[PDB]
Point group: D2
Chain length 114, copies 4
Amino acid sequence: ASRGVNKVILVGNLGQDPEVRYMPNGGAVANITLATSESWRDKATGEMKEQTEWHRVVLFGKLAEVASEYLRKGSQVYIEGQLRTRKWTDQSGQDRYTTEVVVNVGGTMQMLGG
Amino acid sequence: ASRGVNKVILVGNLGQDPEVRYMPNGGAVANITLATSESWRDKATGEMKEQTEWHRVVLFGKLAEVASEYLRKGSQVYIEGQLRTRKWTDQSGQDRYTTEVVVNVGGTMQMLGGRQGGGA
Amino acid sequence: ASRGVNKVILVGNLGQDPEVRYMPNGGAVANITLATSESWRDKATGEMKEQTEWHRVVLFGKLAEVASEYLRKGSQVYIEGQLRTRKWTDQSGQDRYTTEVVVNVGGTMQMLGGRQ
Amino acid sequence: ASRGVNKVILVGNLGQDPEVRYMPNGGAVANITLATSESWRDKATGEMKEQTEWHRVVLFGKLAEVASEYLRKGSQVYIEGQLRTRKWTDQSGQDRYTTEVVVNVGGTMQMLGG
């Protein structure tokens, strides 16, 4: 063929309110940041030893809007976007961010969250 | 005591042979780079186009090894790892890479895929 | 292709309290039934129509227990088991049930309150 | 309280030709049967036993067609449908089949390369 399967699945809480914004063509684009966590106590020296990944998801169109009107910090959502590392040059050098992009092929859904 | 679900699923072809290591000379860590692709005929030229994401997957333990013994450039694998963006300071500033880490909760599997008969 | 990938992912609510069982082996086996839902509109025969699949998940070992101690009707869990249609002859004919089996390769996790 | 996430992911080989049908008036419906496998040696016998699940996937629209035109037996596909147990009364009693339904939210893709 010439395609493959690039899929990301997430169940997490927004760590910050939806970071909305618009662009050319007049685009709706939410930038929520999810946080998954995985703990595993045993053999160390003190207290606690948890780890929590922070995903940089990226919504578009409706979802973007939806996110904006109803998503809040603490909420718990299920994302089915896809990996998309994007290059951008900072105030000098080139930086790239891998973000969770939910475009059609996937979709957000929230739970009872908090 | 937080958890949630951080899962990545990939079906793709390695774009470069597998980068394998062993620490402590057995904590094997493979670093294969997958490539997924998504085309479409560009409408304004009518020509063919194709953007292709390159994922940086990371295998461990057995899979790492497995990858090493049987995973070659162009091979097609199914990974079920999880997202793990990790921070590292370059030769000056701080950089972070989001890699596909396959640790237990997931696992690699290859298809007959493309480009075989290695050792002509 | 020689082994393939059989994976099921679910986010749903138990429709009834668990159903723990202990087999000779000594293991515990929870049989919670999840319910996913998908509503939608039309123009043929219906209003805002909603159909809801009922998955028959199957837990083992710890999870089975966990489920038992803290899973009740209405809880919301994330299962990562695998499809497993199993044949069994009823009080006469042969019947087969496709159940969501979570064995190692996957795992349960609940939303809103947990092992806490 | 009217959703959740019901998703099935499969990478497998059709165990035989895709049963391709074109509904009463138009849209088709493919009925390919996937086969996943899981082996292991016997902790005593040493035999290389292997259990293999057979999924009953269901394609629609394009995919259905695609399947028909290019999915040959033995083909290896990736399905991203969702679980859908459906009730039907046999030539007497009530029977229910849990099938892998690929409707929009998912999609078929075959492997090959050679």
